[PDB]
Design a protein around this ligand. Structure first.
Ligand SMILES: [Mg+2]
Ligand SMILES: [Zn+2]
Lengths: 184, 151, 155, 87, 81, 129
RNA sequence: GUCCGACUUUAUGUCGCGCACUGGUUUUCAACCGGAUCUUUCCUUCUGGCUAACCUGUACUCCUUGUGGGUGCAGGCGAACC
């Protein structure tokens, strides 16, 4: 049942993940009866330093909240199946271009479709189980931008090792180096 | 600290939290929030009353946080929006109350002064709403249609 | 506009030097001549299908457009077949390196093909003189309503 | 101070306040240059060796001078945990 | 003074200051899960409740209007959450 | 009411610099302050500074090194020609060996020398040196 | 490369500012403006042109075997231009 949960099936890696998903459908009582109707949008790979890798599943985002309901169970099962791989559940959002003055009008690009907002939602979804409590931006002596994220000290244990995963994956999405924070 | 009509410089207000999303401990459903909002509106309570009651009685912090949209917009989409925005209507109610007091007892002059202040505020707000076009462009507030809108 | 039966006053308004033959065995409406004014401006459909005469219509009459093109806002409509357009602009006074709000009022002549309300913004064109003060014809009402598009609100 | 051929034409490049990098004026009869004695292993003050500091008149006037020096006494490791960079 | 870390105020100093003047404008209030002495149900109340909050179960008004927090009704039990 | 947040930012900077402080809390923190401070910092009057999210208008806290002497804003952002640049440089900057008039350009926020080498000029914002 | 001076009636070498004019600049370099580009990132975009251009690939290689370069026309490269 791999075929109809990707909407198109190149990049055989997804198939294994889909097979993984199939192998986790079979846990019927708690991880099914809703888990079937969750289409994908071309899960991708990210190189991770230290020998690991990060696989980013791209939800079409009509019902992202369903993922964010199942997420802890599904992510832990996927981690168990794939050794030395860190799975993340990213929303994919359609970025729209700038309303450049010379380009013809395209009916009011909504702010939810804009670079800053989409990257913010990317960061929010990158670490789901723990919520972001604050945001900081720094610029070193040279003049390059770095961003710091005040995570909740409570509940952090749903990560406990995935900080480099988030760092590297978001770097490869945009390129801006990031460091995360743990408060007292 | 502005306080157009009094040199008072206070800053009494509320600082809503940083978390745009809902609190993690909330168990109510956003939809059920919507139906209770609409039913209280049917009872007639203004969206400020709606917000204060939902904050006092239930885990409703900000209906914008929970339902993803704001109370007046919920009412407008559901077709329960009042013809006159609540703040304006309260201004008319206060102005007509002061007018009745003034006509009742003539010599009170600070009453007249506060009435002038209130009429200034109400003209100002009506101008704003006409620019945003919530009100009809011919909507005018003087004395008698004022009393009719009091009803 | 000319407002309900252009054939109104003591003389006949025939579109000059155009003849519709009664002898014709078709009984067609009329030979309603027109022309494309140029400058990449589209003549409105009501200019072709319309029933007015308006010798001063740049689209159906005898007047011709050339020269300056202005973009203003309609401020006065009360006079017949003609419009008064406000033009607000800035004037650089150099002694203070500052700018000065100024406004002029240019009359113009609107063809019946155009509907104009107070507050509209209008692309107007210079023409052969029409009257003592009129030297322009309206060519394009850009904002027919603009913000008056919607008139109600029923979700 | 650098000419064309590359020579020093300014006369006595003056110091800056170690507490606020402000210069020390010629007749700034409020600044003070502290010399802190170096300490060897066994607790003898080595003569001729020292850490130098310069506090400008302005910082002394505001009364913050001691505070600033505490900072330095921490940053150069001449003194232990007196000052809190976060307060 | 003259050198701080405005990024990292002391938490004691942080709550020491007034809200609207902290690093992030945070609210002082909170939400209490209060149970009436009669009914064991749990009713949520905003700490500085304005209206006379009533349990929908029974007419057992739990918190009375006040300038600050609403005053409880001497029999209820509150839980911080 | 507050009118030009950049003026308030630079006024806080000058006040806290003159007193000899090292950090400044800029309250309103709009785009123009951020660009202004990156220009500043790449020139070196400022060290490693910081932005803060607030869900509303954010905030800035900026580290100093005492390197600065005075900043300031020309609040009515005057239209400057490519020629009139020398006029402002003479009337504001201490000496052309240094100093920087900061103006917004078709390229963006930019000090006067960058403007002259890019051969562009726009509206003037402030002056730092 | 050209060669300027101590060097003086005049030439070579030596030694001089470390080149008085012509030159590569992936020896790094540094700027200092650019331009095209890929990033869920359009530059009015079409409607035909004209195809300027080869993804064409067709008859096939003219060339040491090697796409260095050619006689060459149906889909189809459009800013190189109308
Ligand atoms: Mg502004
Ligand atoms: Zn009870």
């Amino acid at each position: 049942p791999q075929a109809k949960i990707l909407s198109q099936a190149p990049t055989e890696l997804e198939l294994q993940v889909a097979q993984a998903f199939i192998d986790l459908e079979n846990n019927s009582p708690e991880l099914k009866a809703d888990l079937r109707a969750l289409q994908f949008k071309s899960i991708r790979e990210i190189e991770v330093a230290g020998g690991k890798k990060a696989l980013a599943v791209f939800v079409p985002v009509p019902s992202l909240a369903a993922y964010h309901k199942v997420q802890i169970k599904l992510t832990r099962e996927l981690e168990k199946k794939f050794q030395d791989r860190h799975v993340i559940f990213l929303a994919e959002r359609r970025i729209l271009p700038k309303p450049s003055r010379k380009s013809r009008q395209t009916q009011k690009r909504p702010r939810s479709r804009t670079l800053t907002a989409v990257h913010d939602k990317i960061l929010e979804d990158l670490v789901f189980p723990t919520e972001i409590v604050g945001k900081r931006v720094r610029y070193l002596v040279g003049g390059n931008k770095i961003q710091k994220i005040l995570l909740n000290s409570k509940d952090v244990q749903h990560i406990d090792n995935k900080l480099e995963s988030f760092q590297a994956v978001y770097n490869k999405l945009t390129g801006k180096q990031i460091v995360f924070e743990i408060p007292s | 600290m502005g306080r157009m009509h009094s040199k008072g410089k206070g800053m009494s207000s509320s600082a809503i939290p940083y978390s745009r999303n809902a609190p993690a401990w909330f168990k109510g459903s956003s939809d059920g929030v919507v139906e209770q909002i609409i039913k209280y509106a049917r009872k007639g309570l203004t969206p400020s009353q709606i917000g204060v009651l939902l904050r006092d009685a239930h885990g409703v912090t900000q209906a914008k946080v929970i339902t993803g949209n704001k109370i007046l917009r919920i009412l407008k989409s559901n077709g329960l929006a009042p013809e006159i925005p609540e703040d304006l209507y309260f201004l008319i109610k206060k102005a007509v109350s002061v007018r009745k007091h003034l006509e009742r007892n003539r010599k009170d002059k600070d009453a007249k002064f506060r009435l002038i202040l209130i009429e200034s505020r109400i003209h100002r707000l009506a101008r704003y709403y006409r620019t945003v076009s919530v009100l009809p462009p011919n909507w005018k507030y003087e004395s008698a249609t004022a009393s009719a809108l009091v009803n | 506009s000319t407002e309900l039966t252009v054939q109104s006053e003591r003389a006949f308004q025939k579109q000059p030097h155009i003849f519709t033959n009664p002898k014709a065995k078709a009984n067609r409406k009329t030979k309603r001549w027109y022309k494309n004014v140029g400058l990449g401006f589209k003549t409105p459909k009501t200019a072709i299908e319309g029933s007015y005469i308006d010798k001063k219509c740049p689209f159906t009459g005898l007047v011709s457009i050339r020269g300056k093109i202005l973009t203003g806002t309609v401020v006065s409509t009360r006079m017949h077949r003609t419009i008064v357009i406000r033009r607000d602009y800035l004037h650089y006074v150099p002694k203070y390196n500052r700018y000065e709000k100024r406004h002029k009022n240019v009359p113009a002549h609107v063809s019946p093909a155009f509907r104009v309300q107070v507050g509209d913004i209008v692309t107007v064109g210079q023409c052969r003189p029409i009257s003592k003060t009129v030297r322009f014809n309206v060519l394009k009402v850009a904002s027919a309503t603009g913000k008056a598009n919607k008139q109600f609100a029923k979700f | 101070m650098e000419n064309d051929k590359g020579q020093l034409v300014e006369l006595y490049v003056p110091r800056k306040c170690s507490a606020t990098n402000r210069i020390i004026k010629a007749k700034d009869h409020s600044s003070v240059q502290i010399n802190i004695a170096q300490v060897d292993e066994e607790g003898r003050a080595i003569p001729g060796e020292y850490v130098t500091y310069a506090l400008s008149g302005y910082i002394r006037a505001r009364g913050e001078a001691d505070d600033s020096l505490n900072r330095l006494a921490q940053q150069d490791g001449l003194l232990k945990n007196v000052w809190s960079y976060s307060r | 003074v003259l050198v701080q870390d405005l990024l990292h105020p002391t938490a004691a100093s942080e709550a020491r200051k007034h809200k609207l003047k902290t690093l992030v404008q945070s609210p002082r209030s909170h939400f209490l899960d209060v149970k009436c002495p009669g009914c064991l149900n749990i009713t949520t109340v905003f700490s500085h409740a304005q209206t006379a909050v009533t349990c929908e179960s029974c007419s057992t008004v739990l918190c009375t209007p006040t300038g600050g927090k609403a005053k409880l009704s001497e029999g209820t039990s509150f839980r911080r959450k | 009411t507050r009118t030009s947040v950049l003026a308030d930012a630079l006024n806080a900077i000058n006040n806290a610099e003159k007193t000899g402080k090292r950090q400044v809390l800029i309250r309103p923190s709009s785009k123009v302050i951020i660009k202004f401070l990156q220009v500043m910092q790449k020139h070196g009057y400022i060290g490693e500074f910081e932005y803060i999210d607030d869900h509303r208008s954010g905030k800035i806290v900026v580290q100093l090194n005492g390197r600065l002497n005075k900043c300031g804003v020309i609040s009515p952002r005057f239209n400057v020609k490519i020629a009139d640049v020398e006029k402002w440089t003479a009337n504001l900057l201490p000496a052309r060996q240094f100093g920087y008039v900061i103006l917004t350009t078709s390229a963006g926020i930019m000090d006067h020398e960058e403007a002259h080498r890019k051969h562009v000029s726009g509206k003037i914002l402030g002056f730092v040196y």
